[PDB]
């Protein structure tokens, strides 16, 4: 199995930037390397084949170079429709293999999240389960840390997070984290809080409530 390692795994860039993505193969593969572009929920599209040949219909700002073990995909002037995930792919031997992909993201200014916490509705408690939702709204960059605390004790292994793609209007991220526990456990504790750490916040920000609107 020929392994393809892309770098970086993601990068933030602006419209007009020169962008460079590297692909490294575990053994020499001559010029048997292709590049694909994929956008969320769409099929990949071929950009470059045989290391440096431009696929028909692909704009000339895309170019490929390299040979042997080191390959490069270059976008000479990044356009808005170029934010996407890029994959290298080797056809030197079987099985065919792919790089892990490089996500080209939109660069912008740091933005602190606005943090909101939601208690479980009484309607949900009737089913026997309680969900406590922490929302982080419109922040950048994507990296953020969410800590759940119950009666001031740091939780782990009982939450799940989900993050949106970059907003089409302001290029920010939003994140929702859900703490899940039974109604019986929810009734046995008073203080529920999520603490958010992010580059835009001088100190971590905590949103809390007391069970029963106390």
């Amino acid at each position: 199995d020929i392994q393809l390692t892309q770098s970086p795994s993601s990068l933030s860039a602006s419209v007009g930037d020169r962008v460079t993505i590297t692909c490294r193969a575990s053994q020499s593969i001559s010029s048997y390397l292709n590049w694909y572009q994929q956008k969320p929920g769409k099929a990949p599209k071929l950009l470059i084949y045989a290391a440096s040949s431009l696929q028909s219909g692909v704009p000339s700002r895309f170019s490929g170079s390299g040979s042997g073990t080191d390959f490069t995909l270059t976008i000479s002037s990044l356009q808005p429709e170029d934010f996407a995930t890029y994959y290298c792919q080797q056809s030197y031997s079987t099985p065919r293999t792919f790089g892990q992909g490089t996500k080209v993201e939109i660069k912008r200014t740091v933005a602190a999240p606005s943090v909101f916490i939601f208690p479980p509705s009484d309607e949900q408690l009737k089913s026997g389960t309680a969900s406590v939702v922490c929302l982080l709204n419109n922040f950048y960059p994507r990296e953020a840390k969410v800590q759940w605390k119950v009666d001031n004790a740091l939780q782990s292994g009982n939450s799940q997070e989900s993050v949106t793609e970059q907003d089409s209007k302001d290029s920010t991220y939003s994140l929702s984290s859900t703490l899940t526990l039974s109604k019986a456990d929810y009734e046995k504790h008073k203080v529920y809080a999520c603490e958010v750490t992010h580059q835009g916040l001088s100190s971590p920000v905590t949103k809390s409530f007391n069970r029963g609107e106390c």
């Binding site: 292709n34 994929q38 071929l46 084949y49 099985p95 929302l135 709204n137 989900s162 859900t178």
Partner: protein, 226 residues
């Protein structure tokens, strides 16, 4: 124009079988090698299998060798992937892809055209409509001029669900998050929107949740608590 229309996806119990189809048009199908590629939810592209123009040479990825069979019908211009003994790791969107040049042209192989993809979910979970719960902001909140509210779309199977707000008349500030898979095998999703704090008890906010695989439509009004 080259077309590759795929079908045959859906939910399959673990250990069962499923046949995928890829109908080709707009090129001479029987002189082209064809491939299957898959992509697990949130993951990278992963090569699956290849079949030569005449069906004679077939090769498979290490993780599917033995279980998967690739085949073709050069009269119907259709590519097939028989998938047997499915595991949770086989859950993915499956693409078919056409080689760039006829098989008898000796060039670097590249996948110059791909099908739209068909989703295969390997799971024993039963189809279930979602429960929609309100994510209500507090009535006595004083922290800002903007408030967030939302809907918690919990315990449905399978994907996907659609969430709009006020029948689509509210799109500004709306964030519908990717679903997450819980340890019960059911999916969970949140859709939120930020609105003027002064609007909460005056403007009516309704999240519209539709889940086709169960023909379930739920309209939930989200109001402040207490």
């Amino acid at each position: 124009e080259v077309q590759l229309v795929e079908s045959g996806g859906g939910v399959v119990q673990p250990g069962r079988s499923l046949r995928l189809s890829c109908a080709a048009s707009g090129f001479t199908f029987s002189i082209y090698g064809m491939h299957w590629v898959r992509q697990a939810p949130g993951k990278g592209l992963e090569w699956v299998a290849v079949i030569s123009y005449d069906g004679s040479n077939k090769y498979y990825a290490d993780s599917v060798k033995g279980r998967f069979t690739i085949s073709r019908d050069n009269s119907k211009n259709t590519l097939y992937l028989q998938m047997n003994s499915l595991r949770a790791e086989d859950t993915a969107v499956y693409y078919c892809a056409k080689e760039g040049r006829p098989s008898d042209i000796v060039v670097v192989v590249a996948f110059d055209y791909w099908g739209q993809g068909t989703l295969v979910t390997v799971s024993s979970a039963s189809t279930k409509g979602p429960s929609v719960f309100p994510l209500a902001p507090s009535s006595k909140s004083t922290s800002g001029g903007t408030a967030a509210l939302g809907c918690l779309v919990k315990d449905y199977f399978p994907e996907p669900v659609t969430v709009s707000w006020n029948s689509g008349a509210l799109t500004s500030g709306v964030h519908t998050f990717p679903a997450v898979l819980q340890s019960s095998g059911l999916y969970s999703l949140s859709s939120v929107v930020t609105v003027p704090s002064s609007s909460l008890g005056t403007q009516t906010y309704i999240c519209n949740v539709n889940h086709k695989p169960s023909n379930t439509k739920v309209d939930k009004r989200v109001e402040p608590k207490s």
